[PDB]
């Protein structure tokens, strides 16, 4: 899944569906919060708004 466009890719390019606090592994979420104030990961993952 990379070469297709259309119907599957809406989900996987994050214009709909899961947040970036739900699409990441639950240890990378922890890392992001704890190292928030020293090295932000804020602009590195996009949160869909629908």
């Amino acid at each position: 899944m990379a070469t297709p466009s259309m119907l599957p890719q809406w989900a996987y390019m994050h214009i709909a569906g899961q947040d970036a606090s739900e699409y990441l592994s639950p240890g990378l979420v922890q890392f992001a919060r704890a190292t928030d104030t020293y090295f932000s990961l804020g602009n590195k993952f996009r949160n869909p708004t629908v």
């Binding site: 990379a2 070469t3 297709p4 466009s5 259309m6």
Partner: protein
């Protein structure tokens, strides 16, 4: 799929780079001579050429794909030259 504005095609298919686009792609050539020219591989009959130079021809990763190059070249040059 192989395109999203046309039906997917399977097996052998054709593409063309034609040097006959000199007013549909010649606003990208103003310092590109004919030996360095940019030209479209998208040749949509019923779409405007200006807005159709940014379309993409997809190839699925079911199999590796490789084009078969063929070149038709005609040169006219003199025999006393800088070349």
């Amino acid at each position: 799929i192989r395109y999203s504005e046309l039906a997917p095609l399977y097996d052998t298919t054709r593409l063309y780079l034609v040097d006959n686009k000199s007013a549909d792609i010649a606003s990208l050539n103003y310092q590109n001579d004919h030996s360095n020219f940019l030209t479209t591989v998208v040749q949509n009959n019923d779409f405007t050429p200006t807005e159709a130079s940014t379309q993409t021809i997809n190839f699925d990763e079911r199999s590796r794909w490789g084009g078969q190059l063929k070149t038709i070249m005609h040169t006219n040059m003199p025999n006393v030259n800088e070349f």
